[PDB]
């Protein structure tokens, strides 16, 4: 019963960061080797755990969070960082035990004329709680006068589209991100590394 990490990592379609996907990994044996053996990933940064020795530890539950963002914004997906993606799309806990993995996806997620299916939230009234999702489409009042359902000055639609083109630079090129959350709770451990 090997853990289904391939479904998250090799998925044909990835979610937008505002509507990021979470998959629970449980009651399975996890080979993290597939991840560390690979030369595929541009970012593999682990907090509270070494990239190696994950197999020797056992985790009560694992959560895999998948989204697509532009490459520079991978720097936002880290504990304690600030910015549009961290503040309004995906927030990582300060006490984060897990790994952040990212790879370039330009041939998969870019098209001539641009791919505008991937989206991000530019504005929110408050900064997001850790592991919180907002899929709202309400107009944002950045000014004193109410919007009354109409976009305008200081009244804006919350969401905008990344424009992903092959001609774009790597920082603005599409990148696929999986964040692995390892949790310790007072429960028998569903997910265990193969060694133990």
């Amino acid at each position: 019963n090997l853990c289904p990490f391939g479904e998250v990592f090799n998925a044909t379609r990835f979610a937008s960061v505002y509507a990021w996907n979470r998959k629970r990994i449980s009651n399975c044996v996890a080979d993290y080797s597939v991840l560390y053996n690979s030369a595929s990933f541009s970012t593999f940064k682990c907090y509270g755990v070494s990239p190696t020795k994950l197999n020797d530890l056992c985790f009560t539950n694992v959560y895999a969070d998948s989204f697509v963002i532009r490459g520079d914004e991978v720097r936002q997906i880290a504990p304690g960082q600030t910015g549009k993606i961290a503040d309004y799309n995906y927030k990582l806990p300060d006490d984060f035990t897990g790994c952040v993995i990212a790879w370039n996806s330009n041939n998969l997620d870019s098209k001539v004329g641009g791919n505008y299916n991937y989206l991000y939230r530019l504005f929110r009234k408050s900064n997001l709680k850790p592991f919180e999702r907002d899929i709202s489409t309400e107009i944002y009042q950045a000014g004193s006068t109410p919007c009354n359902g109409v976009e305008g000055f200081n009244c804006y639609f919350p969401l905008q589209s990344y424009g992903f083109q092959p001609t774009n630079g790597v920082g603005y090129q599409p990148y696929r991100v999986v964040v692995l959350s390892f949790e310790l709770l007072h429960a028998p451990a569903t997910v265990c590394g193969p060694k133990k």
Partner: antibody
Amino acid sequence: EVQLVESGGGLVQPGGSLRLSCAASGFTFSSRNMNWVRQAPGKGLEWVSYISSSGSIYYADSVKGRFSISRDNVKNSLYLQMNSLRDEDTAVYYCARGVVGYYDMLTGPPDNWLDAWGQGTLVTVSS
Amino acid sequence: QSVLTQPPSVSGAPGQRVTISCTGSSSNIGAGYDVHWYQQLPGTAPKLLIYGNSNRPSGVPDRFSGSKSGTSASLAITGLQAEDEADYYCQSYDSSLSGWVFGGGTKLTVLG
């Protein structure tokens, strides 16, 4: 909120030594990597030293063999020890907070963008 | 002699757009190493305006923008405002030096 306080600067003679201390409040100091950056009067910024959460240390070539970096997580403090001081070492030294420390399977330099800066301590070396 | 070279002075009256450039070498920018941009008001400690070549920290106005091409990297300021006047610095990592490198710095004055 985040407070970074630098102390131990003064006017000292060339060939002298002194210790700079940075006291940190408002954040979890152990998790953050920390840096020392200096700015000479009417001049640009120069990076001096870096200390990771793990304790990995990198020094600039100009300061190697004369400056040392230390951290005490109980006292939430960063320390820079300066020996064989030169006139070129005269600058305002800034305590700088780096990114949250991480273990990287991939090769390459650590992420070091300095979001938090102290007001600084001026160190003047003159004969 | 700075590994990253910046224009010394830039001038613009309010509401204009100005660009600040950070030139690079095969060791620092153009090796793919990230460029960070800092703003320093006179008599104050430096403040981070752009990190990860393009990302903007919270509380930093949308007018500031970051882009990079080849060895060079640029910061764009639009809708210029009096508070924007500061000395601006660019940061990157140099492989030969085995340390992070800062530019000489640029002085921007809103013409006022």
